[PDB]
Amino acid sequence: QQVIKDLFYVVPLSRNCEKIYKNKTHILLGISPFNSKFSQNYIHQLIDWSSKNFKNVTVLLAGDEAKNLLEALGTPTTKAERKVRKEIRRHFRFSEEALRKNGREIDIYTFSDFKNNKIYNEVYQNVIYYFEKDEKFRKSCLAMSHDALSSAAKSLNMEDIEITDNMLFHAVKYVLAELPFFLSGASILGYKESVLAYHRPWKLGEKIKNSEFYIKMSDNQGYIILKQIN
Ligand SMILES: CCCC[C@H](O)CO
């Protein structure tokens, strides 16, 4: 079906991201936890479209720091850990279904699956260094934390909770743990090049692409926004 091939219109972060996208080497599908967008049918659309368009497809699920999102919203730690595991198992099941249907390898990971990967750890250490040492970079990281907390609360019916600094700093551990895949996902995984794909703009990525930080995306790493249009 060519309806499936055209299921999404692609908006690249940069012209470099567009070239990586048009190379079609690899797409990494970012599945956010505690986000109403990622229903079973949406995850199916993502993988159906990706399987018809890219040579290699990988799905990225949230790792352990996803519990920090729930904690910052009040959830006690063991209930939060339990709900993360249920959320991740749900994402995995829906992702596995669609990949199996497309005759694709079940290439699904969490961002916590790479603690013995040198690329992940070195990029993570760079992210932490500049979070601590560059207030400009820290401010952008905390804004990403705000976005993740706002989206979680709305999807869990908690827009009545004010978002404080200590909430932001607790949740930003989620942001820092996922960012190495924004910056170097292809090199972490072992592909020549890759685009991380998501449905919302990445404003910190726009600043990185404007040369505003010592933090850089890898030359073989891009970011694309997927939109659906009639
Ligand atoms: C599991 C990490 C999700 C990545 C998405 O782009 C949202 O951060």
Author numbering: 2 to 231
Question: Which text from the study accompanies this structure?
Answer:
The DBE moiety sits in the P2 pocket and the nitro-groups H-bonds with S33, Y199, S152 and interestingly to R153, which we speculated would interact with the AMP 5′-phosphate group of aa-tRNA substrates. To validate the docking experiment and test the importance of R153 to reactivity and active site architecture, we produced the mutant R153A (BtCDPSR153A). Structurally BtCDPSR153A is extremely similar to the WT BtCDPS and BtCDPSS33C. However, activity with both Leu-tRNALeu and Leu-DBE is completely lost, supporting our observation that this residue likely has an important role during catalysis. Besides the loss of enzyme-substrate interactions, the structure of BtCDPSR153A highlights R153 importance in correctly positioning the active site S33 sidechain (ESI†). The conformation of S33 sidechain is rotated by ∼85°, which orientates it to an inward facing position, closer to the sidechain of Y199 (another catalytic residue) to form an alternative H-bond in the structure of BtCDPSR153A when compared to WT BtCDPS (2.8 Å vs. 3.5 Å). Additionally, helix-7 is displaced (<2 Å) in the BtCDPSR153A, due to the absence of R153.
Cyclodipeptide synthases (CDPS) are a family of tRNA dependant enzymes that synthesise cyclic dipeptides using two aminoacylated tRNA (aa-tRNA) as substrates. Here, we investigated a CDPS from Bacillus thermoamylovorans (BtCDPS), a cLL-synthesising enzyme that utilises Leu-tRNALeu as a substrate, and is predicted to be part of the biosynthetic machinery involved in pulcherrimin biosynthesis. This intermediate then reacts with a second aa-tRNA to form a dipeptidyl-enzyme intermediate, which undergoes intramolecular cyclisation aided by a conserved tyrosine residue to form a cyclic dipeptide.
